[PDB]
Design a protein around this ligand. Sequence first.
Ligand SMILES: O=P(O)(O)OC[C@H](O)CO
Length: 411
Amino acid sequence: ETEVQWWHAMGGANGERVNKIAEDFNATQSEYKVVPVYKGNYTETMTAAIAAFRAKEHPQIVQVFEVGTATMMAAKGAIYPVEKLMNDAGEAFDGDAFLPAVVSYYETPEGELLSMPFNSSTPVMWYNKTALDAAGASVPTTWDEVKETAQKLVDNGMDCGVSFGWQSWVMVENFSAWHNIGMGTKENGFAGFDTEFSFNNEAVAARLDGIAAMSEGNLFKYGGRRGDSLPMFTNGECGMWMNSSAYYGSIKSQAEFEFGQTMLPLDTSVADAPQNSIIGGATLWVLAGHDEEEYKGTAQFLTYLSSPEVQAWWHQETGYVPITTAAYELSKEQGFYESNPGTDTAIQQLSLNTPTPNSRGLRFGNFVQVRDVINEELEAVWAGDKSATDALNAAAERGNTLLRKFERSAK
Ligand SMILES: O=P(O)(O)OC[C@H](O)CO
């Protein structure tokens, strides 16, 4: 058998599902063996795959988070564009089948998808319904309601009211799209490499300052980057938790309480109605430099991932959105949204209203490094070391240096 190495960043429950998908494909035919290899968080996984390319130890497939897309698109010669791979191997590829938001987010300026969609998400407001009920609180729709609900929870003895993971993705990137404000110039990077950051504005700053002020009295508690704060929610310590829809699998298995999810809170001091939320998660890039049989097996595995049944199973088990309309329709016909209330929140929120350039998503080179900058500066806010105005100004300044570095090399 010819092995197809797939380096990915799926840990915990979702990682076990990756291994089930690969092995199911391996059991259906006798020519190709997909070998999934966990390489760490998204940054570690992308870094590892790129570093391996010199020693020719790089995988056939690498999962690269949405953040890394501009960098991967500029890495011409390192990637095998998926449409060319599929045609070369004799496998179908129909980009139009993917959700419109996925297509608009990932397509090149000429309308081509270079990578294979797989795990797309958006942030939702997770909540402990048991704790809300005991506190006499309601599911919030606005930021004022988030604070009031947090107060009721803590008054009723909850350790803390609200927290969030992936804080830049949630409280800067998605917060901006949800309120139709720009994240950077040149249409959040889609219109040019000469972009600069625009999130250092009064709307974002005032919200971050408001959250920091909730630390007193434990209405808010910071619980770290990425998914580090997950056990705060599943242990029943915080009653509200904003993070990826893709925590559904972990939450369903680890939470001893009744849980729900709803759309992100609206900051009514910024807007009277929400816009839409934006993509998170990753896509699958095929790397150059391998042989024909390795690519044939890669293409056949991508076909296995393209089926509505596999896409629906992945969505149902993880909380990543159904990546195609067909997978959504299959899940609906199976009664999944009736039997599991709220699992259609993420797909609805991505397409809530006709998008604007501010709500398409983001495309910034070196955004892997900018993500660290933004997390560092937000941590300075939670620690009381900087105001949000100063922290965001520093994040935009440091981020702009990274954008200029990318622009200089992308020519
Ligand atoms: O937890 P995920 O896979 O939905 O990813 C969250 C963010 O989009 C990562 O940048």
